[PDB]
Paper text:
As a = d = β-branched specify blunt-ended α-helical barrels, we explored all four combinations of Ile and Val at these sites. CC-Type2-VV, -IV, -VI and -II, were helical and bound DPH in solution consistent with α-helical barrels. Interestingly, X-ray crystallography revealed that oligomer state increased through this series: CC-Type2-VV was hexameric; CC-Type2-IV, heptameric; and CC-Type2-II, octameric. Concomitantly, the dimensions of the internal pore diameters increased: VV, 4.8–7.7 Å; IV, 6.2–9.2 Å; and II, 9.0–11.0 Å. Finally, the modelling offers a clear explanation for why the ββ and Lβ classes exclusively form non-collapsed Cn-symmetric α-helical barrels. Sequences from both classes scored worse when threaded onto most of the slipped and collapsed structures (upper-right-hand regions of Fig. 7e). More specifically, by disfavouring alternative states, potential steric clashes involving β-branched Ile residues at a and d appear critical for maintaining parallel α-helical-barrels structures.
CCs are quaternary structures comprising two or more α-helices supercoiled around each other with cyclic (Cn) or dihedral (Dn) symmetry. Here, we describe variants with all combinations of the aliphatic residues, Ile, Leu and Val, at a and d to give four classes of peptide: the ββ class, with a and d = Ile or Val; Lβ, a = Leu and d = Ile or Val; βL, a = Ile or Val and d = Leu; and LL, a = d = Leu. Peptides are named systematically appending the one-letter code for the amino acids at the a and d sites to “CC-Type2-“; e.g., CC-Hept becomes CC-Type2-LI. In summary, solution-phase data and X-ray crystal structures demonstrate conclusively that different classes of Type-2 coiled-coil (CC) peptides—i.e., based on abcdefg repeats with predominantly hydrophobic residues at a, d, e and g—adopt a range of distinct states.
Author numbering:
A (entry chain B), B (entry chain A), C (entry chain C), D (entry chain C), E (entry chain A), F (entry chain B): 1 to 30
Write the structure that this text describes.
């Protein structure tokens, strides 16, 4: 359980990277 | 099982990063 | 415990990637 | 075994990110 | 212990990605 | 052991991402 919860924290952080990359794409378009 | 399922959630989030990066490439080309 | 703590260190490093990507977006906009 | 196989799926997804970043580099150069 | 040490190697590699992204930001600004 | 070896494969792939990001920085400079 404790290991699985820490791994889920990694998944959440990776999703934050994906959103930041989408921000870059929008800045390039603009 | 519980840990393996959480690791698979990380793999899915990483694929979302890959798609966001492809969106940057398309914005550069456009 | 020790494995979970190492995984949390990965999560923190991933958040640092997200902030660096945000800096790229601001540089492109500027 | 099952945890190791899930971790290998993460490794493959990370390689797909690397290729997408290479596409950005080619788009910038072009 | 062996698994925790390998996870710490991932954290170090992620920090190397963060620095490479900062180099992109500097190149854009320059 | 088997889990640790799979985690080391992830670290190697993350380093490949860092190198690809450096390629982007060089393309921007050029």
């Amino acid at each position: 359980g404790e290991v699985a919860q820490a791994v889920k924290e990694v998944a959440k952080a990776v999703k934050e990277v994906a959103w930041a990359v989408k921000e870059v794409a929008q800045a390039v378009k603009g």
